[PDB]
Curated annotation (Swiss-Prot), chains A, B:
This is HTH-type transcriptional regulator QacR. Residues 23-42 bind DNA. The lineage of its organism: Bacteria, Bacillati, Bacillota, Bacilli, Bacillales. It holds the Pfam family TetR_N. InterPro entries: DNA-bd_HTH_TetR-type_CS, Homeodomain-like_sf, HTH-type_Tx_Regulator, HTH_TetR, Tet_transcr_reg_TetR-rel_C_sf, Tscrpt_reg_QacR_C. The keyword Transcription regulation applies. Transcriptional repressor of qacA. Binds to IR1, an unusually long 28 bp operator, which is located downstream from the qacA promoter and overlaps its transcription start site. QacR is induced from its IR1 site by binding to one of many structurally dissimilar cationic lipophilic compounds, which are also substrates of QacA. Residues 1-60 form the HTH tetR-type domain. Keywords: DNA-binding, Plasmid, Repressor, Transcription, Transcription regulation. Homodimer. Binds cooperatively to DNA as a pair of dimers. GO terms for molecular function: DNA binding; DNA-binding transcription factor activity. GO terms for biological process: negative regulation of DNA-templated transcription. The gene is qacR.
Length: 186, 186
Protein backbone atom coordinates (compact mmCIF):
# COMPACT_ATOMS: atom_id res chain seq x y z
CA UNK A 1 0.00 0.00 0.00
CA UNK A 2 2.61 2.59 0.89
CA UNK A 3 4.18 1.36 -2.38
CA UNK A 4 0.85 1.52 -4.18
CA UNK A 5 0.25 4.98 -2.73
CA UNK A 6 3.59 6.11 -4.17
CA UNK A 7 2.75 4.77 -7.64
CA UNK A 8 -0.63 6.47 -7.50
CA UNK A 9 0.62 9.85 -6.46
CA UNK A 10 3.53 9.55 -8.85
CA UNK A 11 1.13 8.82 -11.69
CA UNK A 12 -0.83 11.98 -10.90
CA UNK A 13 2.28 14.10 -10.52
CA UNK A 14 3.63 12.94 -13.87
CA UNK A 15 0.28 13.72 -15.49
CA UNK A 16 -0.07 17.21 -14.03
CA UNK A 17 3.54 18.24 -14.58
CA UNK A 18 5.28 15.70 -16.79
CA UNK A 19 8.13 13.29 -16.13
CA UNK A 20 11.08 15.68 -16.01
CA UNK A 21 9.43 18.37 -13.86
CA UNK A 22 8.25 15.81 -11.27
CA UNK A 23 10.75 15.22 -8.44
CA UNK A 24 10.96 12.19 -6.15
CA UNK A 25 11.02 14.75 -3.39
CA UNK A 26 7.49 15.71 -4.26
CA UNK A 27 6.52 12.08 -4.66
CA UNK A 28 8.05 11.32 -1.29
CA UNK A 29 6.20 13.98 0.67
CA UNK A 30 2.86 13.79 -1.18
CA UNK A 31 2.52 10.05 -0.62
CA UNK A 32 3.66 10.53 2.96
CA UNK A 33 6.55 8.16 2.46
CA UNK A 34 10.34 8.60 2.62
CA UNK A 35 13.33 8.74 0.29
CA UNK A 36 14.47 5.43 1.76
CA UNK A 37 11.18 3.73 1.07
CA UNK A 38 11.07 5.05 -2.46
CA UNK A 39 14.65 3.88 -3.06
CA UNK A 40 13.97 0.40 -1.66
CA UNK A 41 10.96 0.03 -3.92
CA UNK A 42 12.08 1.65 -7.14
CA UNK A 43 15.68 2.78 -6.74
CA UNK A 44 15.12 5.58 -9.27
CA UNK A 45 12.49 7.83 -10.81
CA UNK A 46 13.15 6.03 -14.12
CA UNK A 47 12.32 2.73 -12.54
CA UNK A 48 9.37 4.16 -10.70
CA UNK A 49 8.01 5.42 -14.03
CA UNK A 50 8.59 2.01 -15.64
CA UNK A 51 6.55 0.36 -12.92
CA UNK A 52 3.67 2.76 -13.45
CA UNK A 53 3.85 1.90 -17.16
CA UNK A 54 3.77 -1.72 -16.13
CA UNK A 55 0.63 -1.26 -14.09
CA UNK A 56 -0.96 0.79 -16.90
CA UNK A 57 -0.03 -2.03 -19.25
CA UNK A 58 -1.89 -4.52 -17.06
CA UNK A 59 -5.02 -2.38 -16.90
CA UNK A 60 -4.98 -2.07 -20.67
CA UNK A 61 -4.90 -5.85 -21.00
CA UNK A 62 -7.66 -6.23 -18.42
CA UNK A 63 -9.71 -3.72 -20.42
CA UNK A 64 -9.03 -5.44 -23.76
CA UNK A 65 -9.97 -8.81 -22.24
CA UNK A 66 -13.47 -7.61 -21.50
CA UNK A 67 -13.65 -5.37 -24.55
CA UNK A 68 -12.78 -8.03 -27.16
CA UNK A 69 -16.07 -9.78 -26.41
CA UNK A 70 -17.67 -7.37 -28.90
CA UNK A 71 -15.51 -9.00 -31.58
CA UNK A 72 -16.58 -12.60 -32.28
CA UNK A 73 -13.89 -13.36 -34.87
CA UNK A 74 -10.21 -12.42 -34.74
CA UNK A 75 -10.54 -10.34 -37.91
CA UNK A 76 -12.85 -8.16 -35.87
CA UNK A 77 -10.55 -8.25 -32.86
CA UNK A 78 -7.86 -6.85 -35.16
CA UNK A 79 -10.13 -4.02 -36.29
CA UNK A 80 -11.38 -3.27 -32.78
CA UNK A 81 -8.03 -3.41 -31.01
CA UNK A 82 -6.49 -0.98 -33.48
CA UNK A 83 -9.39 1.39 -33.22
CA UNK A 84 -9.29 1.19 -29.41
CA UNK A 85 -5.58 1.97 -29.44
CA UNK A 86 -6.24 5.04 -31.50
CA UNK A 87 -9.21 6.39 -29.61
CA UNK A 88 -8.13 5.59 -26.08
CA UNK A 89 -4.74 7.24 -26.57
CA UNK A 90 -6.36 10.40 -27.93
CA UNK A 91 -7.29 11.13 -24.35
CA UNK A 92 -4.71 9.19 -22.35
CA UNK A 93 -3.33 11.61 -19.71
CA UNK A 94 -0.03 9.78 -19.25
CA UNK A 95 0.78 9.88 -22.95
CA UNK A 96 2.73 13.10 -22.64
CA UNK A 97 4.93 11.94 -19.78
CA UNK A 98 5.53 8.78 -21.76
CA UNK A 99 6.67 10.75 -24.83
CA UNK A 100 8.93 12.71 -22.50
CA UNK A 101 10.28 9.53 -20.88
CA UNK A 102 10.84 7.65 -24.12
CA UNK A 103 12.59 10.51 -25.90
CA UNK A 104 14.72 10.88 -22.80
CA UNK A 105 15.92 7.34 -22.12
CA UNK A 106 16.17 5.90 -25.61
CA UNK A 107 19.88 6.69 -25.53
CA UNK A 108 20.64 4.57 -22.45
CA UNK A 109 20.25 0.85 -23.12
CA UNK A 110 19.72 0.49 -19.37
CA UNK A 111 16.09 1.65 -19.29
CA UNK A 112 15.78 0.90 -23.01
CA UNK A 113 16.01 -2.76 -21.96
CA UNK A 114 13.05 -2.99 -19.56
CA UNK A 115 11.00 -0.98 -22.06
CA UNK A 116 11.10 -3.81 -24.55
CA UNK A 117 9.84 -6.27 -21.95
CA UNK A 118 6.95 -3.81 -21.76
CA UNK A 119 6.48 -3.33 -25.48
CA UNK A 120 6.50 -7.10 -25.88
CA UNK A 121 3.41 -7.23 -23.71
CA UNK A 122 1.64 -4.83 -26.07
CA UNK A 123 2.64 -7.05 -28.97
CA UNK A 124 1.26 -10.20 -27.33
CA UNK A 125 -2.19 -8.76 -27.92
CA UNK A 126 -1.54 -9.10 -31.66
CA UNK A 127 0.26 -12.38 -31.25
CA UNK A 128 -2.82 -13.93 -29.68
CA UNK A 129 -5.13 -12.47 -32.34
CA UNK A 130 -2.95 -13.78 -35.18
CA UNK A 131 -2.36 -17.20 -33.62
CA UNK A 132 -6.03 -17.64 -32.75
CA UNK A 133 -6.89 -16.41 -36.22
CA UNK A 134 -4.83 -19.28 -37.64
CA UNK A 135 -6.68 -21.96 -35.66
CA UNK A 136 -9.90 -20.63 -37.22
CA UNK A 137 -8.86 -20.45 -40.83
CA UNK A 138 -9.46 -16.72 -40.72
CA UNK A 139 -6.05 -16.52 -42.29
CA UNK A 140 -2.80 -18.41 -42.44
CA UNK A 141 0.37 -16.88 -41.14
CA UNK A 142 3.46 -18.95 -40.46
CA UNK A 143 5.52 -16.06 -39.09
CA UNK A 144 3.13 -14.81 -36.42
CA UNK A 145 5.72 -13.19 -34.13
CA UNK A 146 6.93 -11.21 -37.12
CA UNK A 147 3.60 -10.05 -38.52
CA UNK A 148 2.76 -9.19 -34.89
CA UNK A 149 5.70 -6.84 -34.29
CA UNK A 150 4.75 -5.31 -37.60
CA UNK A 151 1.06 -4.75 -36.83
CA UNK A 152 2.07 -3.40 -33.43
CA UNK A 153 4.49 -0.81 -34.79
CA UNK A 154 2.56 -0.05 -37.96
CA UNK A 155 -0.48 0.72 -35.81
CA UNK A 156 1.48 2.75 -33.28
CA UNK A 157 2.89 4.91 -36.05
CA UNK A 158 -0.55 5.64 -37.44
CA UNK A 159 -1.67 6.57 -33.93
CA UNK A 160 1.45 8.62 -33.15
CA UNK A 161 2.15 10.57 -36.34
CA UNK A 162 -1.32 11.61 -37.39
CA UNK A 163 -1.83 14.34 -34.79
CA UNK A 164 -3.62 17.22 -36.58
CA UNK A 165 -6.78 15.97 -38.33
CA UNK A 166 -10.29 15.44 -36.90
CA UNK A 167 -10.85 12.26 -34.91
CA UNK A 168 -13.21 10.78 -37.48
CA UNK A 169 -10.74 10.89 -40.35
CA UNK A 170 -8.18 9.09 -38.21
CA UNK A 171 -10.55 6.26 -37.24
CA UNK A 172 -11.54 6.11 -40.92
CA UNK A 173 -7.85 5.73 -41.88
CA UNK A 174 -6.95 3.32 -39.10
CA UNK A 175 -9.82 1.16 -40.26
CA UNK A 176 -8.70 1.41 -43.87
CA UNK A 177 -5.35 0.18 -42.64
CA UNK A 178 -6.74 -2.82 -40.70
CA UNK A 179 -8.59 -3.64 -43.89
CA UNK A 180 -5.61 -3.43 -46.23
CA UNK A 181 -3.35 -5.23 -43.78
CA UNK A 182 -5.72 -8.10 -43.04
CA UNK A 183 -6.16 -8.48 -46.80
CA UNK A 184 -2.48 -8.83 -47.55
CA UNK A 185 -2.43 -11.84 -45.24
CA UNK A 186 -4.48 -13.94 -47.64
CA UNK B 1 29.64 29.09 -42.01
CA UNK B 2 27.56 30.70 -39.23
CA UNK B 3 23.82 30.24 -39.79
CA UNK B 4 24.53 26.86 -41.36
CA UNK B 5 26.81 26.00 -38.44
CA UNK B 6 23.96 26.71 -36.03
CA UNK B 7 21.52 24.53 -37.96
CA UNK B 8 24.15 21.82 -37.77
CA UNK B 9 24.50 21.98 -33.99
CA UNK B 10 20.78 22.35 -33.36
CA UNK B 11 20.08 19.34 -35.56
CA UNK B 12 22.42 17.32 -33.33
CA UNK B 13 20.96 18.57 -30.06
CA UNK B 14 17.42 17.87 -31.26
CA UNK B 15 18.45 14.25 -31.84
CA UNK B 16 21.10 13.63 -29.15
CA UNK B 17 18.49 14.99 -26.72
CA UNK B 18 15.07 16.24 -27.82
CA UNK B 19 13.03 19.31 -28.77
CA UNK B 20 12.43 20.54 -25.22
CA UNK B 21 15.57 18.81 -23.93
CA UNK B 22 17.58 21.41 -25.87
CA UNK B 23 17.11 25.15 -25.50
CA UNK B 24 18.20 28.24 -27.44
CA UNK B 25 20.83 28.80 -24.77
CA UNK B 26 22.57 25.50 -25.47
CA UNK B 27 22.69 26.03 -29.24
CA UNK B 28 24.37 29.38 -28.68
CA UNK B 29 26.89 28.62 -25.92
CA UNK B 30 27.97 25.61 -28.01
CA UNK B 31 28.61 27.58 -31.20
CA UNK B 32 30.81 30.47 -30.03
CA UNK B 33 27.92 32.77 -31.00
CA UNK B 34 25.84 34.83 -28.60
CA UNK B 35 22.18 35.15 -27.64
CA UNK B 36 21.25 38.25 -29.62
CA UNK B 37 22.14 36.68 -32.96
CA UNK B 38 19.38 34.52 -34.35
CA UNK B 39 16.78 36.88 -35.82
CA UNK B 40 16.19 37.42 -39.57
CA UNK B 41 16.88 33.70 -40.06
CA UNK B 42 16.13 32.26 -36.62
CA UNK B 43 13.68 34.49 -34.75
CA UNK B 44 12.34 31.68 -32.56
CA UNK B 45 13.26 28.11 -31.57
CA UNK B 46 10.13 26.66 -33.17
CA UNK B 47 11.27 28.54 -36.26
CA UNK B 48 14.82 27.16 -36.15
CA UNK B 49 13.46 23.67 -35.63
CA UNK B 50 10.95 23.84 -38.47
CA UNK B 51 13.87 24.99 -40.60
CA UNK B 52 15.94 21.89 -39.75
CA UNK B 53 12.97 19.68 -40.62
CA UNK B 54 12.62 21.46 -43.94
CA UNK B 55 16.31 20.72 -44.65
CA UNK B 56 16.37 17.06 -43.56
CA UNK B 57 13.15 16.51 -45.47
CA UNK B 58 14.54 17.82 -48.76
CA UNK B 59 17.88 16.08 -48.25
CA UNK B 60 15.98 12.83 -47.88
CA UNK B 61 13.56 13.23 -50.79
CA UNK B 62 16.58 14.07 -52.92
CA UNK B 63 18.59 11.04 -51.79
CA UNK B 64 15.48 9.07 -52.67
CA UNK B 65 15.42 10.59 -56.18
CA UNK B 66 19.07 9.69 -56.65
CA UNK B 67 18.35 6.15 -55.43
CA UNK B 68 14.91 5.12 -56.60
CA UNK B 69 16.33 4.60 -60.10
CA UNK B 70 17.40 1.17 -58.97
CA UNK B 71 13.70 0.29 -58.82
CA UNK B 72 12.11 -0.47 -62.20
CA UNK B 73 8.55 -1.12 -61.01
CA UNK B 74 6.69 0.93 -58.45
CA UNK B 75 6.14 -2.24 -56.44
CA UNK B 76 9.89 -2.32 -55.92
CA UNK B 77 9.93 1.45 -55.33
CA UNK B 78 7.61 0.99 -52.34
CA UNK B 79 9.83 -1.74 -50.79
CA UNK B 80 12.93 0.27 -51.55
CA UNK B 81 11.62 3.53 -50.03
CA UNK B 82 10.58 1.71 -46.89
CA UNK B 83 13.93 -0.06 -46.53
CA UNK B 84 15.98 3.09 -47.05
CA UNK B 85 13.97 4.93 -44.39
CA UNK B 86 15.66 2.57 -41.96
CA UNK B 87 19.17 3.44 -43.13
CA UNK B 88 19.09 7.16 -44.07
CA UNK B 89 20.50 9.79 -41.71
CA UNK B 90 17.84 12.25 -42.76
CA UNK B 91 14.46 13.28 -41.32
CA UNK B 92 13.65 9.89 -39.72
CA UNK B 93 16.27 10.30 -36.96
CA UNK B 94 14.30 13.38 -35.85
CA UNK B 95 10.90 11.70 -35.52
CA UNK B 96 11.19 11.57 -31.73
CA UNK B 97 11.79 15.32 -31.56
CA UNK B 98 9.00 15.99 -34.04
CA UNK B 99 6.53 14.05 -31.85
CA UNK B 100 7.20 16.39 -28.94
CA UNK B 101 7.12 19.58 -30.98
CA UNK B 102 3.88 18.39 -32.57
CA UNK B 103 2.13 17.64 -29.29
CA UNK B 104 3.35 20.86 -27.69
CA UNK B 105 2.65 23.34 -30.47
CA UNK B 106 -0.33 22.03 -32.45
CA UNK B 107 -2.47 24.78 -30.91
CA UNK B 108 -0.99 27.95 -32.41
CA UNK B 109 -2.28 27.52 -35.99
CA UNK B 110 0.72 29.61 -37.08
CA UNK B 111 2.65 26.34 -36.82
CA UNK B 112 0.20 23.62 -37.92
CA UNK B 113 0.06 25.53 -41.22
CA UNK B 114 3.75 25.32 -42.11
CA UNK B 115 4.06 22.15 -40.03
CA UNK B 116 1.50 20.41 -42.24
CA UNK B 117 3.03 21.76 -45.45
CA UNK B 118 6.01 19.63 -44.40
CA UNK B 119 3.72 16.62 -44.04
CA UNK B 120 2.91 16.72 -47.75
CA UNK B 121 6.51 16.10 -48.79
CA UNK B 122 6.46 13.18 -46.36
CA UNK B 123 3.45 11.50 -48.00
CA UNK B 124 4.30 12.71 -51.49
CA UNK B 125 6.81 9.95 -52.11
CA UNK B 126 4.03 7.37 -51.56
CA UNK B 127 1.62 9.55 -53.49
CA UNK B 128 3.83 9.38 -56.57
CA UNK B 129 4.57 5.69 -56.06
CA UNK B 130 0.93 4.70 -55.55
CA UNK B 131 -0.37 7.01 -58.28
CA UNK B 132 2.22 5.89 -60.83
CA UNK B 133 1.50 2.30 -59.92
CA UNK B 134 -2.06 2.85 -61.08
CA UNK B 135 -0.90 4.11 -64.46
CA UNK B 136 1.69 1.33 -64.64
CA UNK B 137 -1.21 -1.03 -63.97
CA UNK B 138 0.62 -2.59 -61.02
CA UNK B 139 -2.41 -2.05 -58.78
CA UNK B 140 -5.74 -0.26 -58.39
CA UNK B 141 -5.99 2.34 -55.63
CA UNK B 142 -8.89 4.80 -55.47
CA UNK B 143 -8.16 6.58 -52.19
CA UNK B 144 -4.49 7.21 -52.92
CA UNK B 145 -4.19 10.09 -50.44
CA UNK B 146 -5.47 7.84 -47.67
CA UNK B 147 -3.22 4.92 -48.57
CA UNK B 148 -0.27 7.29 -48.86
CA UNK B 149 -0.88 8.74 -45.40
CA UNK B 150 -1.46 5.24 -44.06
CA UNK B 151 1.70 3.78 -45.63
CA UNK B 152 3.71 6.81 -44.62
CA UNK B 153 2.60 6.66 -40.98
CA UNK B 154 2.73 2.88 -40.73
CA UNK B 155 6.30 2.94 -42.00
CA UNK B 156 7.45 5.79 -39.75
CA UNK B 157 6.06 3.52 -37.04
CA UNK B 158 8.17 0.52 -37.91
CA UNK B 159 11.17 2.79 -38.26
CA UNK B 160 10.68 4.80 -35.07
CA UNK B 161 9.64 2.10 -32.58
CA UNK B 162 12.35 -0.46 -33.40
CA UNK B 163 15.49 1.69 -33.11
CA UNK B 164 17.19 -0.65 -30.65
CA UNK B 165 17.04 -3.91 -32.58
CA UNK B 166 19.41 -5.58 -35.04
CA UNK B 167 19.41 -3.25 -38.07
CA UNK B 168 19.05 -6.27 -40.32
CA UNK B 169 16.18 -7.65 -38.28
CA UNK B 170 14.51 -4.30 -39.05
CA UNK B 171 15.05 -4.53 -42.80
CA UNK B 172 13.48 -7.98 -42.50
CA UNK B 173 10.29 -6.77 -40.77
CA UNK B 174 9.99 -3.74 -43.01
CA UNK B 175 10.26 -5.95 -46.08
CA UNK B 176 7.60 -8.26 -44.66
CA UNK B 177 5.49 -5.15 -44.11
CA UNK B 178 5.94 -3.88 -47.68
CA UNK B 179 4.97 -7.34 -48.83
CA UNK B 180 1.92 -7.55 -46.57
CA UNK B 181 0.83 -4.00 -47.46
CA UNK B 182 1.03 -4.22 -51.24
CA UNK B 183 -0.56 -7.63 -51.26
CA UNK B 184 -3.47 -5.96 -49.48
CA UNK B 185 -3.92 -3.28 -52.10
CA UNK B 186 -5.51 -5.93 -54.31
N1 LIG C 1 7.91 -3.76 -31.35
C1 LIG C 1 8.19 -2.89 -30.38
N2 LIG C 1 9.41 -2.85 -29.87
C2 LIG C 1 7.18 -2.06 -29.87
C3 LIG C 1 5.92 -2.58 -29.61
C4 LIG C 1 4.93 -1.75 -29.08
C5 LIG C 1 5.19 -0.41 -28.83
N3 LIG C 1 4.21 0.37 -28.38
N4 LIG C 1 4.33 1.57 -28.13
N5 LIG C 1 5.40 2.17 -28.26
C6 LIG C 1 5.52 3.47 -28.02
C7 LIG C 1 6.73 4.08 -28.26
C8 LIG C 1 6.86 5.47 -28.11
C9 LIG C 1 5.78 6.22 -27.70
C10 LIG C 1 5.90 7.61 -27.60
N6 LIG C 1 6.45 8.14 -26.50
N7 LIG C 1 5.51 8.39 -28.59
C11 LIG C 1 4.55 5.60 -27.44
C12 LIG C 1 4.42 4.23 -27.60
C13 LIG C 1 6.46 0.10 -29.09
C14 LIG C 1 7.46 -0.73 -29.62
Amino acid sequence: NLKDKILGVAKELFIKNGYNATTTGEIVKLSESSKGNLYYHFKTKENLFLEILNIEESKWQEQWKKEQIKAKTNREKFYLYNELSLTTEYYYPLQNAIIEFYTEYYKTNSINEKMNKLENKYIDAYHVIFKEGNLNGEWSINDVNAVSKIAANAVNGIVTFTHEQNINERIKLMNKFSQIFLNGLS
